[PDB]
Amino acid sequence: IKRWERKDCKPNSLPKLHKMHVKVGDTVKVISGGEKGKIGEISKIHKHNSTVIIKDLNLKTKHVKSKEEGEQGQIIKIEAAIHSSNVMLYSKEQEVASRVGHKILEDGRKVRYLIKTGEIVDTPDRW
Amino acid sequence: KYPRRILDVYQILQSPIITEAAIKNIADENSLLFTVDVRADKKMIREAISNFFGVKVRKVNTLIRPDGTKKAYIMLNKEYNASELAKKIGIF
Amino acid sequence: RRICPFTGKKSNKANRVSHSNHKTKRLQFVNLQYKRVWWEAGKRFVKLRLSTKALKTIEKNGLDAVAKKAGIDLRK
Amino acid sequence: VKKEDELKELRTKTNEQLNEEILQLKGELFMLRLQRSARENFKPSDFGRMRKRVARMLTVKREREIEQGVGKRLSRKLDKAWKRSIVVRPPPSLKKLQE
Amino acid sequence: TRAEVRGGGRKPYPQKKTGRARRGSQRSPLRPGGGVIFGPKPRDWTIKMNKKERRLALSTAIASAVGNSFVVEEFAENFEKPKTKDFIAAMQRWGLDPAEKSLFFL
RNA sequence: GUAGAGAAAAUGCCUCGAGCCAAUGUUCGAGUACCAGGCGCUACGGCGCUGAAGUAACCGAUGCCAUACUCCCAGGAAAAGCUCGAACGACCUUCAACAAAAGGGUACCUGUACCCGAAACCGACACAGGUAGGUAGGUAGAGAAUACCUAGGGGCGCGA
RNA sequence: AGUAACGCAAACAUUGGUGAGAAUCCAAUGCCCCGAAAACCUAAGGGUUCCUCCGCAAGGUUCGUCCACGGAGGGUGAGUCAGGGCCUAAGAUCAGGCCGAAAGGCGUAGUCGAUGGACAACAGGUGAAUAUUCCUGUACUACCCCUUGUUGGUCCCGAGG
């Protein structure tokens, strides 16, 4: 790792965090990149660099070495991360990706919606 | 009536030592090994073991490591047995 | 110290001027004196140090007025 | 969940119940320090569970003295005198285990 | 400068009995990390120019742009609220291009 | 023991007292402990049994008796512990305090490794150097010189 | 210039073993050196170099399987040894006090301050690295308890030492 690319830290020894527009499990669509025009659910989030990992997208062959002497290694295919600005939320019942908005409901809970279509994303009790 | 210094009595004993020599010392001398605070004393350690496990202490010997960490040899009376007390803790 | 406790008098910077206008530093000290001064109230002397210019003040205004202006009690 | 109820119970107890309860923890931490050395089955979260539960008690004990009007200089004297008259005892976990 | 740079002051080695070029301070301009000879400082670049020259320079400039200029009527009442879209449409109807530069003096 | 400002001390007076001084030595400590050697085992490390004799004479210290004695001029620390004892003053008290023998019980902090006539300190070096003090064997010898040896440690960090 | 030198003229030698690899590491035998030291303790100082396992990039004036090097883990046990909890010299500080543009200087008791005084332990054994420190045996110092007696003591103060 390169010494200067470490995540910048606040005076309280904690890292400086970014604001995102995604969550774990949300279905999205890649805007640009090598995996352009594909859909998948987000598995993990990396707030310190605004990168996200989607299942079965942006994978690379890793040559795992044989830590044990009794056997040899293998060539595993591991998933990598993508910058969140290169993806967009996606809806299945319309097949149209759009940006994100925010609207208050009658109950008083703030939620986000798709601007073009108009559905709600963060339905309650999903984790 | 006063002690020498004032601090947490429950911090006087951090943890025991687990070495082939320490375990060898339990059976030969009826002793026990314990890492202790730098500000500790033989009196507080003698009073300490008397209260935790309810056993008598024949003698206490101590030393300070080069790293600034104090060690404590604790020889119990022959009436009790350090090996029996060792199994109560979990270490042999 | 060479300070007069009563009047605050002290020495000053002064140069010794030669015929060639050469100037070396010096200090014009104060004419301080150790003396026993009478105090009419308690009817006793007091040991202290003051300048001759301050003696004329006590001789004129009286001791109780001078020492009060300086801000000192005679009883120590 | 263990934040509104934990503090509420302690704010109702008297000082003596709070005092003696701390002595149980300080000795109970010692058993956890033993299990850490023996590599037995111990929960690392118990170190934080108990260490934080002491601070909540000394926190409330201080606040009750603010009501009485105690200063910082005086409170430290009473804290030391309480440690001068301290006496170690076995924890409950040793009594349930010692047989 | 060599006086403002940190360090220096001491003579590193004596003037003679050493087979090397003389030296006065390590923080000299002829060594790295040393002073700067006649380097820049915070300057007041302001100069003076007569008013009638500056006014004449301004008049003759506008008198040259007559072939590429014109006049319009007031339009303050036609904008009841700010809207860049209508403002651009007005320039298109007046014969302008928003891509190029322009100037409204009022 | 006694007199005087006067307990002790000091000074003066009176009186008892042939014995005293201490390195060494005797005995216990001191056991078949330690020990040569022997009997068996082996992964050769030591282990396990066994284990005799354990005295005298001569030489003789720079060490002990020893601030023992003699001589000399340059005339050779202080305080506390310890011991004796009245008054004045202060604190405390019928044991809760002082004092005597035996027995029993209890027992603070730090240093402790390793090098130290040196490769580890001091000399910029794994430098032909400097570094207070203690222990002081055998033959020849006046001798801690010198030569050859013991214990023990070394053959000097490029070689042919 | 692949030149000078590789740090004394106490001296190495063989066999066998280890290993990818040995004049250089280990052992054995023999030879030779120091032996008022080139021996064993120890003060100051250094500050983990000490012990075991692994490794050989760099460091070693060659080599290297080795090392005061590198990595990992472990290691220093005291009522009696040394110092402090007792005393004081040289000397340094100094309550008040005296002096002095300032800082501060002089200075009394007092207090610090071992290079001194005072104060209680030895033998043997155990052994990866410590022991007058741990174990065995036999002693010592201080305090307390116990048993009688005494029943005013403890500091200050005086004197001896």
Next chain:
RNA sequence: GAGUUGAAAAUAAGCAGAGAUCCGGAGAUUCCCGAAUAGGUCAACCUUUCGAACUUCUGCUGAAUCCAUGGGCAGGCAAGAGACAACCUGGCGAACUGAAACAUCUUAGUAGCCAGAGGAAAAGAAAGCAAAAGCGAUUCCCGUAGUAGCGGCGAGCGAAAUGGGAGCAGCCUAAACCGUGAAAACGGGGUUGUGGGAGAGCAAUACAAGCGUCGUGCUGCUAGGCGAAUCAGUGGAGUGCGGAACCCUAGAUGGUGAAAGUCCAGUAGCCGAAAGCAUCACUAGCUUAUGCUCUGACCCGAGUAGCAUGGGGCACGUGGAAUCCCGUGUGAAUCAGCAAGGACCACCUUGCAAGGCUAAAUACUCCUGGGUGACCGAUAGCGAAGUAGUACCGUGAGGGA
């Protein structure tokens, strides 16, 4: 407002829409050294009767010595101590240098040392400038002006008034007298310069000015939220290219595999504070507070001014040398008076010393937030873009990659 237990992955266990982690306000704890302050000490340790030492404050007790002083005892989160880049004030106070030497002179009241204090400090409410006309506290800038002058008349040093701007604020005491007290002293009274107070006698004295502690709101700061507009192709990646659209009170920035108004965070604009701070407004109610005659009687800050002598500093080097400030020694006057107006006298004008406080304009950056660079881009830029004042050197100060 959804994932987290630092940098910093991994491991082992937890917390979390019953709202964690995180972000702000007010609080708690805060080991040892260090002003260090229970005593001692070779800083981060020791001994301890367990104590904020000493000075100050509040009490008690009451040496020589009657009152007192000095001690002694106790109380008291108990005022002060120390630290702090530069600027500022005060005290001590250089030399190289320049004069082509050098002593008068200059460098210079600079540097540095010590002490003190604030966000500014200091100065400051005419015993003043001025000149026959007038100004009306202090400070700063322009300008007067490198002028008038000073000067071994050498080097060199260097004003002020008038004028133009920034910024504007004026107040409290001593004394006469009246009461209270043995005195000291307390209260009232009074505070000014074409002279004013006291004193008496008349009046009518003080509502509208300046203050303003309970607290109540206004506006900002200390966490945040809402927030418009794009698709495909270009063979590592498209923000670029070509082509076709859109928003704009938003084309400020940064990031995104490659340069973005329309991908992300955001910006314009709008909304938002329990608690704390600040700027304003309001509010107690005590509050400082308004004028005409009579008097040349009583007061106008004393060892002071002034003089003699020895010096300093004022642009001004003793010069005709005033004005201002000190050591020694002498030593006035009280409005019918005193000082100043560049020796001094006379006349006139101006002003009222010897008591004190006071905001703004001004100077500085170890720092904080925002913004901008014809500033540097690893020999540069802060010495330092990595465990830099580290490694290393030195007994140490200190030097220093």
